[PDB]
Each structure stands twice: as C-alpha cells, then as structure tokens.
C-alpha cells in the first residue's frame, strides 16, 4: 500500500474525519475500527483523541487498501496517518476503538491492529477497563 497526501478540513468523531484529498473535500471513515458514538461511553474521549491527533499533525496522509475505496455513504475508506503514525492503530492501542468491520480484501493491517487491541486489553485501558 501507498500513503497519499491529504489536508485536514475538520475533525468529526473518533473514527471519521473530513479531509481534502486530490483537492476535493471528502469524509473518511477509518478502516478496521469502531469508536463509540459521541453519546456512548468513551465516545467523547475517542472523538477528542482523534481530533488532537489530526489537528496537531503537520502532515496528514491517507492510505487506501486493496478493495473498495468508498463505502455506501460515499465516505472514503482508508488508514489515516498523522505525522507518520496511524490514527486507526493509535485509537485501538489506547482502548478507544475496537477492531471491527473487517471485510475480506480491505484488511491489510488487520493483524497489526489486533496486536494493538490485545495490548490495550491486557492493560485494561478505557473500553477494556
């Protein structure tokens, strides 16, 4: 897979962010994770975590997987990087997202993220507390 440039338009919630990609505004849904909705436990902490990570970044990148690049709602499906660090993985490692929505052929980073979730669980962080 390949990282491509994007710039932040606006933080949305833990697992969605509005980015400009190839010069066009798009909402991106992070592959392979699920954060709690803003009204559920840890939803505001997940939203705040992502917001900080993308707002503080000097460089945002998006990396598509092998399969579908847009979902049924027109959201881009990608792994999102903030100064080289994957947001999807960071949320999982902190117990602020669960590995989820693992669809065959868009699942390159599945084992990297399950490894993070196992560590978050062992430490009883957040969702796993």
Ligand X SMILES: Cc1cn([C@H]2C[C@H](OP(=O)(O)O)[C@@H](COP(=O)(O)O)O2)c(=O)[nH]c1=O
Annotated binding site for Ca(2+): 15, 34-35
With beta carbons less than 8 A apart as the criterion, state whether 4 and 62 touch.
yes
Q: How far apart are the C-alpha atoms of 65 and 85, rounded to whole Å?
A: 17
Give the count of alpha carbons within 13 A of 121, CB side only.
Answer: 8
Q: Cα Rg for the chain, rounded, in angstroms? A: 14
Residue nearest to ligand X as judged by C-beta position: 101
Active site residue 30: no
Among 26, 28, 29, 82, binds ligand X (CB under 6 A): 29
Contact between 34 and ligand X per CB under 6 A: yes
Shortest Cβ 58–ligand X spacing (Å): 26
Nearer to ligand X, 34 or 110 (CB): 34
Among candidate residues 77, 105, 79, the one with its CA nearest the CA of residue 92:
79
Active site residue 93: no
Which positions lie near Ca ion, rule CB under 5 A?
34-35
């Amino acid at each position: 897979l390949h990282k491509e440039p994007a710039t932040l338009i606006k933080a949305i919630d833990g697992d969605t962010v509005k980015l400009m990609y190839k010069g066009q505004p798009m909402t991106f849904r992070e592959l392979l994770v699920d954060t709690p909705e803003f009204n559920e436990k840890y939803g505001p902490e997940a939203s705040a975590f992502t917001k900080k990570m993308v707002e503080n970044a000097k460089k945002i990148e998006v990396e598509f997987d092998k399969g579908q690049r847009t979902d049924k709602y027109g959201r881009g499906l990608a792994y999102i990087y903030a100064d080289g660090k994957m947001v999807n993985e960071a949320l999982v490692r902190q117990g602020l997202a669960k590995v989820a929505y693992v669809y065959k052929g868009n699942n390159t980073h599945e084992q990297l993220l399950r490894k993070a979730e196992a560590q978050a669980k062992k430490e009883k962080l957040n969702i796993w507390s």
